[PDB]
Amino acid sequence: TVHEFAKELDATNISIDKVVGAGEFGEVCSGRLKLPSKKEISVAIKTLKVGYTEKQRRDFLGEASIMGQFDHPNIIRLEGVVTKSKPVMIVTEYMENGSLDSFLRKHDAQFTVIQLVGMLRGIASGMKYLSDMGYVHRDLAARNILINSNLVCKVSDFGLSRKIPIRWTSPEAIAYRKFTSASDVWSYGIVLWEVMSYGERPYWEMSNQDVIKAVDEGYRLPPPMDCPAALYQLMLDCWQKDRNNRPKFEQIVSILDKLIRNPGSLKIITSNLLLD
Ligand SMILES: Cc1ccc(-n2nc(C(C)(C)C)cc2NC(=O)Nc2ccc(OCCN3CCOCC3)c3ccccc23)cc1
């Protein structure tokens, strides 16, 4: 049933080169995969730890069942699964520069605005496809965006793979679990702020109850330093209280494409939370 959405890979074609992360029930590694065409590519490899239960196997492979449904340049690519041998494995494309928030923090103010908008456009395009497919992410955050050696950004849910993430969640989803593509659009607004602020934490370390209350009262994150007015306005639109008034992802992609094609528009800039 995982094989409905995931190719079975022969473990003979996989080399594990490094353990990258580990937990109580599994590990994340990097390595190489030899494709049926004999081409070899870099991959990430999730393995279950030796001695796992059948239910752990089922839950583990459930992740690949979901991932394999999405084939898009800006969504993490599932290469396949290993189920016929042990340990069971999930194999994905390798994203050399890791999570976007931590990457941008290492490079504060070192990219052009156009480069940043390129990243954001990729993220929007992956989300447009996810929402087209009827899938609500619910965990969209810069930490769950993976960025490769060419700065291409891909939607993942590394977080879940590794409670409501309050800082990234729309008011109605916090209030009563109303998760829709419009709540993902709210989350995308926060990612937009994270990118333009080079990986600053949304709402910093405010008490969660105050994040909920402030946003409910109408307060919003302030424009990042030197933020293009167009991009801050886009944040505010993603953060409309009325979920029906938020832009669709297709509109977001369109807006970002227009800005990329006409960079001059990004020279108009804005000038703890803001009400007005
Ligand atoms: C239960 C569950 C169900 C579904 C998901 N889920 N849903 C999605 C969609 C919807 C966005 C397509 C994506 C995911 N899961 C993931 O995005 N999973 C992963 C993220 C990062 C990884 O590698 C990170 C290591 N890599 C090293 C190099 O630097 C970058 C990070 C992974 C390595 C091996 C296997 C899975 C990985 C998650 C959990």
Side-chain angles (χ1 to χ4, degrees), residues 1-3 5-6 8-17 19-23 25-48 50-53 56-57 59-83 85-161 164-176 178-199 201-208 210-212 214-224 226-240 242-247 249-257 259-260 262-266 268-276:
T1 169
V2 64
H3 289 132
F5 304 108
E8 176 80 16
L9 308 169
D10 185 351
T12 291
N13 285 314
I14 300 168
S15 68
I16 296 180
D17 299 343
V19 176
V20 165
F25 311 100
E27 301 170 0
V28 182
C29 311
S30 74
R32 297 282 277 189
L33 169 66
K34 191 169 188 61
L35 297 174
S37 69
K38 305 308 183 181
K39 179 183 174 194
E40 294 166 8
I41 55 166
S42 295
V43 291
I45 303 152
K46 198 181 187 186
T47 63
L48 221 41
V50 179
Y52 56 86
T53 68
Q56 283 179 309
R57 197 193 66 99
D59 296 334
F60 180 80
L61 291 173
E63 178 177 4
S65 285
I66 293 159
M67 301 177 70
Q69 300 180 26
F70 308 107
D71 176 17
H72 190 278
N74 298 109
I75 298 176
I76 181 175
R77 171 177 182 86
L78 173 73
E79 291 296 335
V81 287
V82 175
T83 63
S85 65
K86 307 190 182 176
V88 63
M89 294 180 191
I90 299 167
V91 184
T92 72
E93 72 183 304
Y94 177 71
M95 310 290 298
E96 294 85 340
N97 282 314
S99 289
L100 185 57
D101 65 316
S102 57
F103 181 72
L104 292 175
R105 281 192 293 272
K106 293 178 185 177
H107 299 292
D108 185 27
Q110 303 173 7
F111 294 112
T112 69
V113 176
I114 289 172
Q115 279 177 313
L116 296 179
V117 176
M119 299 176 184
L120 289 158
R121 197 269 185 203
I123 295 160
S125 179
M127 291 301 305
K128 197 274 182 184
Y129 186 61
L130 278 185
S131 50
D132 274 4
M133 293 284 281
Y135 196 89
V136 182
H137 190 297
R138 301 190 180 201
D139 293 330
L140 175 57
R143 55 180 154 88
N144 285 327
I145 303 305
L146 304 172
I147 178 170
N148 69 14
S149 61
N150 304 328
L151 305 188
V152 180
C153 289
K154 310 207 185 201
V155 179
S156 81
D157 200 342
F158 189 21
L160 184 58
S161 185
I164 281 177
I166 294 302
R167 288 164 156 69
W168 290 269
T169 301
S170 72
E172 71 276 1
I174 295 170
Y176 68 115
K178 182 55 65 184
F179 287 99
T180 67
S181 286
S183 55
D184 277 351
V185 166
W186 178 288
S187 302
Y188 181 87
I190 302 290
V191 172
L192 178 45
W193 187 91
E194 290 181 282
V195 170
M196 298 316 297
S197 75
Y198 283 84
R201 178 174 168 88
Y203 309 91
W204 312 283
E205 287 132 305
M206 292 182 55
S207 314
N208 279 347
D210 286 314
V211 175
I212 292 160
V215 167
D216 186 51
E217 290 183 12
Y219 288 87
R220 298 298 186 262
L221 295 166
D226 300 322
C227 187
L231 292 174
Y232 190 55
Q233 180 66 52
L234 183 54
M235 301 178 200
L236 299 183
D237 292 338
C238 293
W239 301 331
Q240 287 293 306
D242 172 8
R243 74 168 158 286
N244 295 326
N245 293 146
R246 293 169 201 155
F249 277 114
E250 182 175 43
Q251 295 174 302
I252 291 171
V253 177
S254 179
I255 290 162
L256 299 177
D257 279 341
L259 292 166
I260 288 168
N262 304 100
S265 54
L266 293 165
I268 303 166
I269 310 300
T270 59
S271 49
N272 214 348
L273 303 174
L274 300 195
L275 185 57
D276 303 333

